[model samples]
Each structure stands twice: as structure tokens, then as C-alpha cells.
Target: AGHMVPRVMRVLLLGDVATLPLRKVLAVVGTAAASSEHPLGVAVTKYCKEELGTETLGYCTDFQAVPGCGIGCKVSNVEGILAAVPQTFSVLIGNREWLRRNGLTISSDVSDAMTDHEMKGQTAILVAIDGVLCGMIAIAD
Candidate 1:
């Protein structure tokens, strides 16, 4: 008998807002995900490090994981994106319900995008900052 395990995970970043650049989004996601011990979260961290570079992963705090839901944390003092001053942002990474539970409203476009990825068998995770939907990441193995 063989035990099943995910071999590899592929991560793709989707959506972009004016206030938040895709790079910074990666940083926040990677930083927070790095704190999480979940397999999916670890895969996300790996993607961010490989794609965005180690310098992009900024300092974070107040990391709290909600098990099957997702991970929450505040990324602090990440440079080259938010602002010159020490910027602190509350970042949430998880599924639709996880985001909704945190009081974030998901738009139809975002829903469509997630569904589109899900149709292909990818686990789509949403990203929110300061109560605003910023982007989503699709992970496949």
C-alpha cells in the first residue's frame, strides 16, 4: 500500500489593485504564510521566495492561523511598495468563507476568477488587506 501525498504545488497570483502592487502582495502572502506550518501555506511561501526573491519577504507580526480556514497576520515595515515610512497592514489569506467571516465582501469578478481556477482543480485562496480584497492565489499539485 502507498500513502498519498502532494508532490508539488504550483502557485499563481491573480488580481491587482491600485493601492497594492502584485509584488507587495506576494511579500505579504509569503511572509504570513511562512509563519504557518500548513502544507499549502508552505508551498505559497516557497513560490513567493522563488518568484519574488527573499528581500521581498518582509517583517510580520500577530500571526494567527485559523486551521482549515487560513492564516492572518500584520506585515510591518515592508519597503518598496506601501510607503517609505514603516507601513503595517493586516493581511488575510484563505478561502471565500474565511474571507467572508472576516467581514470582506467578495465581488463577482473575484468569485468568477476563483471558480475558473477551481474548475481546473486548483485550490484558490483569497487575499485581503485592511478589509479590502486585494488578490487571490491558485495552488495546484
Candidate 2:
């Protein structure tokens, strides 16, 4: 039988970033009191599990209070969480056509950077929602 976990919205990004990597990006994206929650974390988790048969190796949450914004959450993980998923950055990120058909827009900078030569062989954290892909960062080797 599969273990049952609460459905509270969760997000995580992992990978080595020679400079600032996926983990750092997630920290900024998940910072407490941030007005919006990046659905990318949750989306990536689901894709990794459902499509790739991977299991989360670790999970963490961060929360902070802002004057205007209420409490918020940030999730973290290590590469083990995606061990079953392939190492290929693009496949790990998911299909672009599916993301666009789902009415979601992945941040262009993240997408463009992944396509850039600097990203080859570097691990990346990607978030996908419904079908749209968004939020990603290259990690250090």
C-alpha cells in the first residue's frame, strides 16, 4: 500500500548551481510572505512521481510573516528526491507543448537560460502545473 500524505501545497527544487542554483531559486520563490506561490515545485514533484516513478528523498518548508502578506511556505529537497527521474535537464523539466496547451506560462528567462550553452549537463529544478512548465535553475556540477 502507498503511504498517504497531506495535500498541503508543497514545492521543492534541487541541483548543483556553480553560482546560484535551483535550491537558491526555490528559496527566493518560496520565501515567506511572498505574494504568490510558485506552483512549479508542486508541479515538478507530481511529474517526477507520476511520470518518472521517483520518490521524494527529503522535504522541507519555510515560512515568514510579512506586514502585508500572510504566512507563506517554501519547500526544499536534494537530488535523491528525483533519483528515478532521468538526468536529462529537458526531460526532467517536462514537455513544452503540453505546458502551453494547459494555459500556463513558464517564465521565459528560465526557459531561455536552460537552452543556453551554459546549462548543458547541469542539473535543473523545474516546476510544471496542469501541463505548463515554469520555474527552473541550473545547478553547479
TM-score winner: 1
| Tens digit per residue, CA lDDT, model 1, 18-123 | 5557856566566656655676875787788777666455566556779887877776535543456555567778886686677556678767776776776666
TM per prediction: 0.46, 0.23
What are the candidates' C-alpha RMSDs?
7.4, 17.2
TM-score of 2: 0.23
lDDT per residue for candidate 2 within 9-29, as digits (tens), equals: 324543334443554443323
Give the deviation of candidate 2 from the true structure as CA RMSD: 17.2
Query: After best superposition, candidate 1 residue 11: deviation in angstroms?
Result: 7.7
Off by over 4 Å in 1: 1-16, 20-57, 78-84, 103-121
Q: Among these predicted structures, which one has the highest lDDT?
A: 1
Clashes of each: 0, 8
